[PDB]
Scaffold this active site. Sequence first.
Site, PDB file in Angstrom:
ATOM      1  N   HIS A   1       7.576  -3.086  -3.307  1.00 56.45           N
ATOM      2  CA  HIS A   1       6.234  -3.755  -3.040  1.00 56.45           C
ATOM      3  C   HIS A   1       6.749  -4.574  -3.531  1.00 56.45           C
ATOM      4  O   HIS A   1       5.791  -6.128  -3.713  1.00 56.45           O
ATOM      5  CB  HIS A   1       5.312  -3.570  -3.817  1.00 56.45           C
ATOM      6  CG  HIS A   1       5.253  -2.028  -3.488  1.00 56.45           C
ATOM      7  ND1 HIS A   1       3.754  -1.589  -2.496  1.00 56.45           N
ATOM      8  CD2 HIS A   1       5.036  -0.272  -3.924  1.00 56.45           C
ATOM      9  CE1 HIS A   1       3.685  -0.137  -2.697  1.00 56.45           C
ATOM     10  NE2 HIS A   1       4.375   0.324  -3.338  1.00 56.45           N
TER      11      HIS A   1
ATOM     12  N   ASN B   1      -1.855   2.847  -1.194  1.00 55.06           N
ATOM     13  CA  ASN B   1      -1.553   1.998   0.087  1.00 55.06           C
ATOM     14  C   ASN B   1      -2.788   2.684   0.877  1.00 55.06           C
ATOM     15  O   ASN B   1      -3.368   2.684   0.414  1.00 55.06           O
ATOM     16  CB  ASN B   1      -0.455   3.604  -0.514  1.00 55.06           C
ATOM     17  CG  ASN B   1       1.352   3.678  -0.589  1.00 55.06           C
ATOM     18  OD1 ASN B   1       1.479   2.229  -1.561  1.00 55.06           O
ATOM     19  ND2 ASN B   1       2.092   3.792  -1.066  1.00 55.06           N
TER      20      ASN B   1
END
Lengths: 726, 726, 308, 83
Positions: free
Chosen positions: C101, C174
């Site tokens: 990420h 997510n």
Amino acid sequence: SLAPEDGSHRPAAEPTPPGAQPTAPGSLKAPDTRNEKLNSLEDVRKGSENYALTTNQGVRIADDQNSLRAGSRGPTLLEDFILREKITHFDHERIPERIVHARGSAAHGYFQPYKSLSDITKADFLSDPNKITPVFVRFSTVQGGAGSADTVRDIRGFATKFYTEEGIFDLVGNNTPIFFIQDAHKFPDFVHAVKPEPHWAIPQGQNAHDTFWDYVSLQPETLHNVMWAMSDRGIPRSYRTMEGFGIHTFRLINAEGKATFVRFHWKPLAGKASLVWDEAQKLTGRDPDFHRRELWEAIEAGDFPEYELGFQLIPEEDEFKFDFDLLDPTKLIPEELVPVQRVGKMVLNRNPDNFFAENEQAAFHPGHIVPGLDFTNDPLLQGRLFSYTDTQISRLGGPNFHEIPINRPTCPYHNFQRDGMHRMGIDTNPANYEPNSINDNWPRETPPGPKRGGFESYQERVEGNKVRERSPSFGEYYSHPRLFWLSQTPFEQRHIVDGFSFELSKVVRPYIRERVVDQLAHIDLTLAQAVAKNLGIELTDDQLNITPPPDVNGLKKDPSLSLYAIPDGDVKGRVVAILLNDEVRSADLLAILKALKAKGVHAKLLYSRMGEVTADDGTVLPIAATFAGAPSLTVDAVIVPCGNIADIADNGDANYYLMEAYKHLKPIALAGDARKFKATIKIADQGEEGIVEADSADGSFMDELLTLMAAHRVWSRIPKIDKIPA
Amino acid sequence: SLAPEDGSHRPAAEPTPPGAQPTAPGSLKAPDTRNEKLNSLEDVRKGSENYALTTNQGVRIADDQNSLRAGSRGPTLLEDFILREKITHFDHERIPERIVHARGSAAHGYFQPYKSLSDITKADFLSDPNKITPVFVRFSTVQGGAGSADTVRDIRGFATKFYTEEGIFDLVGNNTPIFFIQDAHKFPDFVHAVKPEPHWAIPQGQNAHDTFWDYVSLQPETLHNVMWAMSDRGIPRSYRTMEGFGIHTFRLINAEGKATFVRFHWKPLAGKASLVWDEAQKLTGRDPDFHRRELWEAIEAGDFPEYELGFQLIPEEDEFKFDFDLLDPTKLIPEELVPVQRVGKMVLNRNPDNFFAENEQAAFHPGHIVPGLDFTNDPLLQGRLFSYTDTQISRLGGPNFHEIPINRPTCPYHNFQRDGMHRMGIDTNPANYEPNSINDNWPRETPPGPKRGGFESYQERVEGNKVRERSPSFGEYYSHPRLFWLSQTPFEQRHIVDGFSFELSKVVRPYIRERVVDQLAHIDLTLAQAVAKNLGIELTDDQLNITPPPDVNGLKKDPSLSLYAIPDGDVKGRVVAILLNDEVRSADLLAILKALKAKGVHAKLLYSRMGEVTADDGTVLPIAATFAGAPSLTVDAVIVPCGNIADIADNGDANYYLMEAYKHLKPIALAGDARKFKATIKIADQGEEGIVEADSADGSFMDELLTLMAAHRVWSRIPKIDKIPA
Amino acid sequence: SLAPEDGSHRPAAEPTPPGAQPTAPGSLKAPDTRNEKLNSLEDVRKGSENYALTTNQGVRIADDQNSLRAGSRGPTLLEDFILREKITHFDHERIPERIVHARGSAAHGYFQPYKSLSDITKADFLSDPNKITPVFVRFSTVQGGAGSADTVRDIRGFATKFYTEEGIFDLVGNNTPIFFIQDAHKFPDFVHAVKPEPHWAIPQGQNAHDTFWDYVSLQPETLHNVMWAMSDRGIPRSYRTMEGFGIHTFRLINAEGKATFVRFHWKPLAGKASLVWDEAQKLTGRDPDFHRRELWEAIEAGDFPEYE
Amino acid sequence: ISRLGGPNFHEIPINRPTCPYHNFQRDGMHRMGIDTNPANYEPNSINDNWPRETPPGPKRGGFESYQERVEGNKVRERSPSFG
Ligand code: HDD
Ligand code: HDD
Ligand code: HDD
């Protein structure tokens, strides 16, 4: 060339007694001492003779004496890359010290078991009496920084890294068989309390301050190890003359899957010996590096430190048979109840080459176990497993700390971990994950089995709710301290009383002293009264009526808890001061040195100046140190030969040397006219046990001196020492 | 076993063309390629086949699929040291990227000079035509992060580490002969301006934003390098097809102490070749790793990148002979005035094994010079010397970055520097200082000399006050940009105009675009008007009257500044897309491939799906990619053989493939019924230059195509492309 | 003065549509947007107008255009502390990116409940519909570096830091409701498999490579999230037009000590919307900052991202 | 840079100036100051070139080095006056 013509800059590459030669890196002092780990370091050892001085980039330096400047009195130029490289490396030399045990001294050696242990463990390093395991051992204090003194009152660390054929095993222990606290959650509270106080960062290397005694007074679980710390165990003579303990109950797992609980012991083959507090404290000023020096020197001499590994073994079905909990790290297992089985011997036989590279950067961690070992639920052990991996990320700069040469396994290591700061290993595996097909899944998992198997945890049953709760079985705080107390000799008990009394007198807040004395009254009223009296505190009637804690499974004492109750004296490697005069009777010295040599006892020849003195027969005697430069603190016994005694009779330093040795209970031997020194220490004509005296230093004189040295100190002299102003 | 039975998981360990085999680590792909640096990394290379999976401590792992938990649906236990070691190492995988040039691709190789240069330099790596010097070269962009795209418009870095017998010499260059700024003090300003804007961190890999053009508009010294960046120089086709330059004037120092000024050059032996902007931009989306891939694949194929080192040499007495200052890094030295003397050849012939360990961790620094070279007062070079040592302390974790394997010298290095984070070398020297007598002063300084001597700086005269002042001699900003412009072909000029116009369109504050147009009016009014017009800006009467800058020492052009003015095409290693149909005419295909193979040109066979198709005669054709999956962006030309043309005639992707290639000026060849595709790109019946066409794919059909490929693109096509909707 | 006379260098401090004004730091663009967290940052915000240029030690700089040198064509001097401080700070600007990420775009906002949840949770931030909790949200892709493109095919991260009165709560989710793998022990394997391959560090921001599909083919547990990533879920039009999920079952605990199993969801009030693959891929070349730009510009325009 | 962890050691509270400090330096480990300047470079038009250089003067002016004359060759040499 700057070395003297005669080659006296360079120490002989032979074992030599302490002081005979400058000390030197291990691979130069003992080049023929080898073991698998020492050899594997050869890729990174860098020599120096005959080589050109260079930058780190391999550029030869013409002038390492000057910066580049515009004219010879002008400003320094920024293009001087040689200066900036050299300065940058210097500017970044330091790394963070260890949070605790920052002060420590290490050496290389080897281990081997006495007999296969395969009946109780499948651990490969214990499977074969003729399979040698290299080790690297670091001994340490706990509280002080890396530049603090050796001979403080503290617990000592005894950490051993075993480079086995099936992985690194680190046995990370201390010199007492229990810890101060029950649950790792409290470790930062306890360590913050013992460490220098946060406002002013005082005191270094000392529990003698308010915060530590505050925490103790409020956390009686600490009292057991506090008792050990206040006894003479807190001030060892040498790392060679203390016990080591893993503290926690661990498991051994055999090829059949059987678990046996074990606690680990190291037994010093040089015997158990501690200093006395006045001596230890003054030695932190006269030589703050005394233990480091002594260990390094013992190894250069061939007086290798040797330890016997031992196991207390408890079958699984006997977990609950004691009246303490085996998983409580504040409780010890008395050897009277569970004998230490001797398992093998470890010999430390070579010093490192570079202290920073090998000692400072070594990473030990009790989670590093191998097949055949396993953990238990000890709540202090459980939290240690998290800390020793986590702390290296800052201390050693990242997750590749196992690639720092001292830390590297000598057995194979392969896996799918990659990258990280200062990554050394260049992996050629096309795959960095598993399962993979692109490298046919290599490296592969290995099923557990009798030898060379993959690691599997013992399938202990766990049944309980998720709780933050101390087991009730841990809630007992006084019986083990009492057992410790009762097992000490009368002089060791007096030293404990004196340890508490000294330490508590430095506590500024008087209620803290009172609260600790109240805790002492729960362990033993004689101890509590003796400490109270020194602090000008009077026990109350209620305190006097506190019921003493129960015996530990029927024991009123266990003499294995005492340093001295059972003699185990070994004089080899000890050291004597010989106080010279300017006309030594050479017949005395010859007999002295011959007897000392016969028992492996070293000597240092001391005088009022350096250089040489000439004995009565013309022998030239080099002087190792002055009376003031190598005080009685640093030796085990003092001998004064005959000769021209008038030379030193009125020397204040020589007289004090004897007074200080006498006060610290060391044997003193006086030959011929040296007997005149009897007056300085007030010995009656008919003499006294602990002072050896004769017309000359015959075989008889040395035998007696040597017998006293085997008993370490002259405890029977204690009533005579409060009179002496030393 | 997870590998397939037929062994097709494993790439062939021999040269193969791009796409024929999966790519692999360099020592597995080309085990027989070697040099002295690659040999010396062998101690840190780790294999994998047939080894057990272990912890980093060497403990075999039994189950690498699960955490340790209390019950198979229970909580994970802290005692799971295998899980925590593995997650800890993952958690700390990343290190900071480089402040600039974070994005880059690297290969091992070697260099050899053509002849000894000892008359002009005592540099050992240039002393002997037989002396081969290993190298590691990293090519890069400047602005974007490590995860940014390759084919951006930007300057490229071309950094070479020479592992010489007398130290590491890093030649840290770019692919244009000047830099944007004059004094290092302004580097963080310039770099902050070009970098993503600090509020929102946009844009990545692009100078097309307000702050960059703001800076440029206010700092006319930047215009020279901006012209290069706006030309097709800013979008090279490959790292193999760009020039490199050291930019600064440095010095060569021969054995008599004579200094010669030098600028360094790298000439691409595969010739100069750039993309066009629309292609380059789209390619950052279709394959952001295109140059990295192209480099790796050239090496795996044996199309090794080759470059020629050259020197422009200026005697010391000629320092002031030019219209510009030799120390001004915004000024080039025209090859018409000082030719490039050829020096040697470099061949990059092995990919790394691990990108992180070798490429990401490599540290290059232009202060790393060797005896026989020295610096000058170029004030941008001067500030560089401070930065590249400094930056490694955070980026690579401390002052031992030279011990990271890729950075280590292959020659000896010994000195008195000690410790620092992740110290590898274990020094056995009893001394860590000089001068010392205890190791006879080793390692020792070495006087300078003809060879194998210590580094001494050249004793240049310095005279003046301590000032923060720019030299007035640097205060001319337009003449070099003008020489560059006039040296370009008309199509290269068009591309420059369109680079400025597109970038300035993305500048949101209109006054910034105007101030840049005003600056261009000072360089050339034709350029300024063409840009102005694309921005809707009208030049004022004043601007139209700005006198152009003087020519540079009498030159009104230098065609060595142009990519294409002087053809230097090489087709070896280029790639052609062959668009297949479901019944290909095999005689066409045999002829195409045979001619391509003869010239070292690769081919990719494309269709609308993967798998295979069968040619008219039954031949099975493996498909490399789909039309959409391997777009025309990625190839140098397109050939369409005959067959069942109906199969793809109405395929949007296949038609578009040709339109995109047509628009980007690539050669296109169409055989038999593949001539139907002429309608899609609007080609006349009688044909046009740049479209090869014939009944069948030979006689001279492949020679004509191969001739177009040697010319790189069909520049004459440019007026035709605005028509096409592609 | 270098600014233009007409003040067109400075964007208006009022909401404006995308492209109408230069974008600006949030406290200059929307100075009167406040929440407790934004206000608490005031001690560390540093302005610039009307202040002298200094070193970090507060020493005013006379010439920020030149190194100190012996003569105006001479060597640079080591005693130039102004230059070295400036270059030192530059040389150390970067910190390690996130392991996963690393690519992400973030904004301030606030949360407010619709009703008291004290029947099922004692969480203070959920106790009263008038309790306003500042938040900071970072959206992200998973595989690529901090410098990779936004409109890749990937899972997206959706992380919310709630600055509550009883502690920070981070809800780290997510944009699909499951993950690829069952047990955290396998996360380094999965992540190494999806990340650029270790020999050459290719490809960036793409699952489309051998090692990813190797792992997937050998670990069927991945197939569920693989299906989501292969759908147009893997290519959102905007961080504003995707769902968020906590994935795990957690527990709510109420004041009586009763536990309820909970899975968390974020529902986008702008609706769900994704690109098509050809557009998404091409957009990684035409504007690799498209999602970051679009989030910043929605907020500047007053099209606040809202989620339930 | 090692001892205190990076280039922001001046933002550790004991080390902070009590007088104003403003410049174009950004980022680094442990960055505390949140810069609102639209510009992180100079010269800039987008923030009217602020913060701005200050000419040297009698009080509150910019730092300028004493223009001491330098003259000599580039040498690694100890002055004989020091011997
Ligand atoms: C949960 C925290 C924690 C707890 C409860 C313990 N320790 Fe520990 N210990 C550390 C956290 C730690 C550490 C922070 O991780 C150290 C310091 C730096 C290092 O490398 O490990 C450490 C170092 C350390 C060392 C020094 C190793 C060396 O020489 O490098 C020894 C000998 C011990 N410990 C022994 C013990 C014993 C016998 C304990 C209780 C029975 C104990 N520790 C409890
Ligand atoms: C004063 C600072 C400074 C200035 C004026 C320059 N650079 Fe630089 N350069 C750096 C500070 C720096 C750096 C901060 O030190 C980098 C980033 C990370 C590193 O290791 O070095 C760097 C990296 C870097 C790299 C990447 C090396 C690699 O691949 O790892 C190249 C090719 C260059 N630079 C080339 C140049 C050229 C041709 C310049 C002007 C002639 C130049 N640099 C000016
Ligand atoms: C065992 C390790 C591990 C596992 C199994 C996961 N992650 Fe994670 N995640 C990390 C270890 C990690 C990390 C290494 O700790 C990161 C990288 C950098 C950071 O600060 O945290 C991270 C970052 C990270 C971010 C970015 C936060 C930010 O913007 O800064 C998000 C949204 C997630 N993760 C979400 C998830 C979800 C929804 C998971 C599965 C349900 C998940 N992670 C599994």
